[PDB]
């Protein structure tokens, strides 16, 4: 049969205000990020969505986004399942740096390639990074399918897809085949990776997809779990276009 | 041996209005949330590190788990919810004023409905102002027993009988694997698991009083029987 699922990326926290690369640092939502989640929830309630399962990353800003949506829906009882495989892209040594400053030191166009291209890998994160130990000693990164030493230290979009797709295949997609209505609370680049796979977007074209924060993304799938058309945003068409331009402008002088 | 943490949510409006929530999905109030928040601060100050949490399907129990996990910075820990941890089903008593009931049917009878071990209250009926808010909710259309087979009132003993399979089948096997587990549940449903784990009689269980917002530690052996009486963690509270 036809299938329908919602994906979204969370709203803003402090480092978004400061225009810093956040990636695997576990920054909390701020007050307006929490409101963005509630607005998604209200939108989803206005369309009478009834979720059967929620999938999230292990970064708390994506879990809190999911809890906030469920509360607006009166669906706090719906199962939630979290995996590092949905984490934001690991940005290596760019973690914590200002974007517009990078665009100064290397050009607007080196920055765009670092952020949106499919294949270029960021400089790895090194033991001298102020947040190295906070990331890799965190107990949430033990309980899994990969030894702590084989966790990544930086990721291209391609690397994201390769550790994300096994989770889609083994956990998410079988529930979709089952007929359940699913919510994915993830991140900018882990959602771009999933969209690239489901929509058959080229290595070249994925560069041009920028996802707005805190906005529901409706995806329709066919009986082979491929997209029927392009992903669609729920909410006002202009306000969303302005919101996309914002994320694009973080990397511009 | 084994360590287990159980606890009970804080208050909402109806617990101030001296009323029966039961299976009605009443929300925490401000102190109800801050109580869970303070309770999470106390488990953090005790360096607690959970691997799995279990709740009922009522939001007062789920928010409580969520606020606690936020205080702990442990929001990534798996949560699992189940009606089998629900508060006791108070039947037709649901929603009624406690005092107004005391003048309708008498001190001694209302007291026996609330404190006994073996007495089933009057069933809730489709005329009840909250019958449809409960049995039409989608969270029961998707549970492990048919909707009609779910109870319309429960003795405290019925609570244990519906809880024990979930404990035997779902929870205890994870206690055995070495996981530090949290159970965010309700007064009655926590009373039934204690009675089972400690071995309390149908007589002592009726007088056991469990405070809200307080981590309740239970130490077990490999047969998962209590090594001693349940203990409260933290300090300085009354009533």
Residue numbers in the entry:
A (entry chain A): 2 to 254
B (entry chain B): 3 to 241
Provide the authors' own sentences about this structure as they appear in the paper.
Bisphosphoglycerate mutase (BPGM) is an erythrocyte-specific multifunctional enzyme that is responsible for the regulation of 2,3-bisphosphoglycerate (2,3-BPG) in red blood cells through its synthase and phosphatase activities; the latter enzymatic function is stimulated by the endogenous activator 2-phosphoglycolate (2-PG). 2,3-BPG is a natural allosteric effector of hemoglobin (Hb) that is responsible for decreasing the affinity of Hb for oxygen to facilitate tissue oxygenation. BPGM is a multifunctional enzyme, functioning as a 2,3-BPG synthase, a 2,3-BPG phosphatase and a phosphoglycerate mutase. The phosphatase activity is responsible for the hydrolysis of 2,3-BPG to 3-phosphoglycerate (3-PGA), an intermediate in the main glycolytic pathway.
The crystal structure of BPGM complexed with 3-PGA and 2-PG has been determined to 2.25 Å resolution. The B factor of 3-PGA in monomer A is 39.0 Å2, that of 2-PG in monomer B is 63.9 Å2 and that of 2-PG in the dimer interface is 56.3 Å2, consistent with the weakest ligand density being observed in monomer B, and likely suggesting different affinities for the ligands at these binding sites. The 3-PGA phosphoryl O atoms interact with the guanidino groups of Arg100 (2.7–2.9 Å), Arg116 (2.7 Å) and Arg117 (2.9 Å), the amide of Asn190 (3.2 Å) and the hydroxyl of Tyr92 (2.6 Å). However, unlike monomer A, a significant portion of the C-terminus of monomer B, which partly forms the active-site structure, was missing (13 residues) due to disorder. Also, unlike monomer A, the side chains of several other amino acids located in the active-site pocket of monomer B, including Arg100, Arg116 and Arg117, were highly disordered, as shown by weak or missing electron density. The phosphate O atoms form direct hydrogen-bond interactions with the imidazole of His65 (3.3 Å) in monomer A and the carboxyl of Glu72 (3.6 Å) in monomer B. In addition, the carboxyl group of 2-PG makes water-mediated interactions with the imidazole group of His65 in monomer B and the carboxyl of Glu72 in monomer A.
